[PDB]
Amino acid sequence: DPKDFPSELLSFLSHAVFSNRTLACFAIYTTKEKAALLYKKIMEKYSVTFISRHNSYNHNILFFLTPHRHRVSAINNYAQKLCTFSFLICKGVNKEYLMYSALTRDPFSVIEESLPGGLKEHDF
Amino acid sequence: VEDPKDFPSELLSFLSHAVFSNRTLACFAIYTTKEKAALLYKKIMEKYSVTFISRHNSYNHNILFFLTPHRHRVSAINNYAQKLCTFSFLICKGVNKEYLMYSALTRDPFSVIEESLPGGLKEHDFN
Numbered sequence: 275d276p277k278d279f280p281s282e283l284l285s286f287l288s289h290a291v292f293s294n295r296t297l298a299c300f301a302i303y304t305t306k307e308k309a310a311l312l313y314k315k316i317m318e319k320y321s322v323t324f325i326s327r328h329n330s331y332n333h334n335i336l337f338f339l340t341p342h343r344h345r346v347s348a349i350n351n352y353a354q355k356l357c358t359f360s361f362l363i364c365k366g367v368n369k370e371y372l373m374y375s376a377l378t379r380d381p382f383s384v385i386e387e388s389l390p391g392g393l394k395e396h397d398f
Numbered sequence: 399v400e401d402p403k404d405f406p407s408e409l410l411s412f413l414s415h416a417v418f419s420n421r422t423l424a425c426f427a428i429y430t431t432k433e434k435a436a437l438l439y440k441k442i443m444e445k446y447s448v449t450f451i452s453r454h455n456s457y458n459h460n461i462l463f464f465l466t467p468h469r470h471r472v473s474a475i476n477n478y479a480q481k482l483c484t485f486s487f488l489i490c491k492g493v494n495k496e497y498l499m500y501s502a503l504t505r506d507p508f509s510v511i512e513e514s515l516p517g518g519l520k521e522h523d524f525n
Contacts, residue, residue: 311433355484356485
């Protein structure tokens with residue numbers, strides 16, 4: 275199992291998962307089956323402004339923007355505990371538009387998302 | 399409504415209700431939500447190297463039915479399944495009457511959603 279996000283995405287993320295800094299943009303790296311489940315569950319739980327699910331290195335990345343702010347560890351506590359089997363990396367996204375954009379391009383691709391083409395820069 | 403407390407009434411006579419027994423079996427069923435069942439279909443298939451697995455509609459939830467190549471205690475299968483995900487209900491019992499249980503799971507009010515062999519199980523596959 276991966277221990278972190280793919281290397282080409284790291285610079286877009288916050289790496290202190292127990293930070294007290296609240297954010298609205300998060301990513302989750304997990305298996306494709308866990309991601310497919312969580313796509314729906316996270317969308318409902320947090321009434322997300324946007325969520326997308328992507329292919330990444332034989333697994334999946336979820337990218338989402340919530341309307342209200344949360345700590346990374348609160349999002350993780352919800353997501354990680356739904357299904358604890360296998361891996362799940364949950365980090366805040368600092369560079370929101372660049373992260374999503376990279377996730378739509380080789381070596382990544384969009385599987386499904388809640389708004390075709392994603393959000394614009396000013397939405398973040 | 400409350401989550402199911404047991405398998406549907408149609409199926410109870412085919413199951414072992416002695417879930418703590420030391421007896422080992424090679425046919426099991428799980429009653430859980432459709433979302434959990436879809437994930438467990440793959441995870442049980444892999445974990446127990448199943449010889450057969452099927453997922454069925456049951457009263458707006460799902461039942462998994464599976465055969466294993468080697469025997470296991472029901473408590474071992476339950477422990478594995480319960481610990482995968484925590485949300486919503488999950489009931490795991492051994493199956494005494496293998497073909498009768500599967501057959502019933504393919505007919506009103508039950509139906510096959512997916513299964514691991516096309517065309518499923520037949521009566522003379524067992525004796």
